[PDB]
Amino acid sequence: DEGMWLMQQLGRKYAQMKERGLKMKEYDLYNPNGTSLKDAVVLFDGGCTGEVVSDRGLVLTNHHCGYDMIQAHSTLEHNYLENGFWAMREADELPNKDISVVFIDKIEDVTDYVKKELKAIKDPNSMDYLSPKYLQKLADKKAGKNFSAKNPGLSVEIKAFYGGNLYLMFTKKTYTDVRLVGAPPSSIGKFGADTDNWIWPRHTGDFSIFRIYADKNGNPAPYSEDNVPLKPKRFFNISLGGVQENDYAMIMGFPGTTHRYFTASEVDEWKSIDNDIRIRMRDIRQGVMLREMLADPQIKIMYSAKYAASQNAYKRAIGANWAIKTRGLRQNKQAMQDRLIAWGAKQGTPRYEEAVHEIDATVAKRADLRRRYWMIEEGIIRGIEFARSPIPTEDETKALQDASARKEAIDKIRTRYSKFANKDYSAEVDKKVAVAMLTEYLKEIPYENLPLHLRLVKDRFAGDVQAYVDDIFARSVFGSEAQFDAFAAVPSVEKLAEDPMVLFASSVFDEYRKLYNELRPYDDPILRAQRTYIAGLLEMDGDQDQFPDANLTLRFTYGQVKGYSPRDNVYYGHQTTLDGVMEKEDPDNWEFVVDPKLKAVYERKDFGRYADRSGRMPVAFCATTHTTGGNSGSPVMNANGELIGLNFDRNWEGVGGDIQYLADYQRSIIVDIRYVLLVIDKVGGCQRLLDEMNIVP
């Protein structure tokens, strides 16, 4: 509802934004024919958002966005991940392989053009209107012959919006020499760590600093020692005025996906299939994993990251199901479609009701298949590590049946075995997880729908899941290192063909691919019906308070700095402070360790001009802006367009906001820019970064 608006929609939203507190001129925020604040926003490394904060190409993003680059440059001698990194001169900034920053140079509405090209319909059921290949052909045709060569660094892309009812062409400028400039220690950059993921109040200094480099003319260039920092078209001024409750705030960024035009049947499906299965299967997996980690400190070391990775979407699904249960998401989608259907009946146009009916029918028809797909994906593909154990290829099997190709096939199989049974793999933990996961899977999936090898539980093992799993490891070539070596010394095709682990892995992957192939055709009638459904919604209520679904393109959102009540008698305010970091300190818990330089800054109150009017040091704030995955690192602006923070998370209560914005619960979690500058200054001691930024009082 609140919205992730197209840049083109700024004109028709401007008066509402001004009434909510916006003070800057419209064209200073976004001008299609000139320089604006939009020119200081980048897509950071294909996922995250970033922002240019100096005339020498300095870029701020999240610590979790620059995490891989900080890790790749870290060694035992210089652990930047643990201690932070602060290049004291431009020449000390570290280059990064496979990095990019994307500027959105121009945005053009090309709807009439794409719709005229589409009229050359060979098949009315064609999915070319959503095809990246087809749309790229139209983008190249419009840009001209050899556009990439005529304009080095630039590229053109056409994307569909509103389910294929609007098309925009983006002219992008990409830079691949982006150097690591600064990062706080992980104790600040990821303070809450996984315990505080999706949590408000939040006390995390989630930022990192990069610098865009380019050739002598400021044109994109790959890494070269002769590259010079980019002098950009526009950069953000940093505000030190802070935030107050009810202050206007706005964000620009690249939200990835939303499902704002789901029917009520799609909400029911998301809850009853997607979320309930992910919740149930991950709770079983996590429960066994946690019991084993708590009983053996060596298991805790090997499985902590696997446990944390599973918990992230598990928490999301719990938050999403809480919104479906308590915030009326299904009911509000039903009211939306019923209103369109009633209006369609008055206009004498039954195609909208026919479109909603096609979506409902497709959802109802794919129910059993989708349930089986989520059950195998959550239960086995993700749930059981030995499902990703080695499967010999057709060429590897042929190589084992008279040439030196046998030793080559064995070396390839060994490399894959060694990756599966790595230093973090416990066959004992995996057997315990598999027994609990398969017990649940076998209770849900009938015999006739089982992957072929799982039929052996009832047929050969008399329903004993433990015995079936024990037999897989006792008899398999991948059951232990000594069993692999005995196989590698005397390898035979017939040994691999009857291997219980190979047959399990092959069988479950065969069923997973068969389900995917049978389910994929159901997406197309839904997409085609959504084009008609969204066209009706737009014709009926206008593209005014109905934003297009997020699709990894540049959007703006506006709101206010505001807390919320999570439950009865509990209020979370709009701002966290450095005192909250100190309250959470736990020296013997890696997630809640506090940097000694930061603790000393707090004790001496060495907050400089970064503290609020009451002398308290701010850390983070939350706002009613509408964000999602892809908005990590987004610049948060004042009513004047000055940088007041970086978006880095959203509270779990608002994750249902991808389907329906939740005004009373959904908040963007933002690191206060005053805390960012305090850390650069008093922790990093990197004064040159402060001096190159334009800091406004």
User: How many whole angstroms separate alpha carbon 287 and alpha carbon 292?
Assistant: 9
Residue 567 within binding range of its own copies, rule CB under 8 A: yes
Catalytic residue list contains 310: no
Q: Which two tokens stand for residue 297?
A: 């400190």
Give the range of 46-54, 311-319, 569-577, 630-638 binding ligand I8A by CB under 6 A.
311-319
Q: How far is CA 633 from CA 45, 404, 467, 507, 624, in A?
A: 11, 53, 50, 42, 17
> x/- string (CB under 6 A) for ligand I8A, residues 218-257?
----------------------------------------
Selecting among 45, 54, 63, 64, the annotated active-site residue is 64
Integer CA distances (angstroms), 297 to 304, 310, 431, in order: 10, 19, 18
The answer to whether residue 583 forms part of the interface with its own copies (CB under 8 A) is yes
The residues in 598-657 that bind ligand I8A, with binding defined as CB under 6 A, are 652
CA distances from 240 to 57, 237, 675 (A): 21, 10, 10
- 195 binds, options its own copies, Cl ion, ligand I8A, none, Cβ within 5 to 8 A by partner type: ligand I8A
| 662 binds Cl ion per the rule CB under 5 A | yes
Contacts to Cl ion from residues 214-273, by CB under 5 A: 232-233
Q: Given candidates 216, 569, 603, 691, which one binds its own copies under the rule CB under 8 A?
A: 569
Judge whether 10 and 556 are in contact, CB under 8 Å: yes
- Is residue 267 within 8 A of residue 333, CB to CB? The reply is yes
Structure tokens that stand for 79 in this block: 């652990």
Task: Look up tokens 């979370």; give the residue.
Answer: 572
384-413 footprint of ligand I8A as x/- string (CB under 6 A): ------------------------------
Rounded to the nearest 5°, which phi and psi values hold at 21?
A: 125, -15
Question: What is the spatial distance between Cα 456 and Cα 577, in angstroms, rounded to a whole number?
Answer: 59
Q: Tell the smallest beta-carbon distance from residue 53 to Cl ion (Å).
A: 13
By the rule CB under 8 A, 280 interacts with its own copies: no
Catalytic residue among 187, 632, 634, 668: 632
Verify binding: residue 665, ligand I8A, rule CB under 6 A: no
The residue among 250 and 318 lying less far from ligand I8A, judged by its C-beta, is: 318
Q: How far apart are CA 306 and CA 367, in angstroms?
A: 30
**One residue of 174, 349, 483, 640 binding Cl ion per CB under 5 A:** 349
Catalytic pick among 39, 45, 177, 206: 206
Omega before 185 within 30 of 0, i.e. cis: no
| Part of the chain binding ligand I8A (CB under 6 A), chosen from 314-322, 386-394, 419-427, 592-600 | 314-322
**Element of type H or E holding 599:** helix 596-604
201 part of the interface to ligand I8A, by CB under 6 A: no
Give the list of residues 6+ apart from residue 261 with CB closer than 8 angstroms, or none.
163, 530, 533, 534, 537, 549
Contact 331, 289 (CB under 8 A): no
Partner from its own copies, Cl ion, ligand I8A, none contacting 21, C-beta within 5 to 8 A by type: none
285, 315, 333, 626: which one binds ligand I8A (CB under 6 A): 315
Q: CB under 5 to 8 A by kind: which of its own copies, Cl ion, ligand I8A, none does 652 bind?
A: ligand I8A
Q: Out of 57, 95, 229, 319, which residue is the one contacting ligand I8A (CB under 6 A)?
A: 319
Q: Are 52 and 232 in contact (CB under 8 A)?
A: yes
Task: Indicate if 206 belongs to the active site.
Answer: yes
On the 0-12 / 13-18 / 19+ scale of CB atoms within 10 A, 615 is exposed
Residue 64 among the catalytic residues: yes
Residues tagged active-site:
64, 206, 632
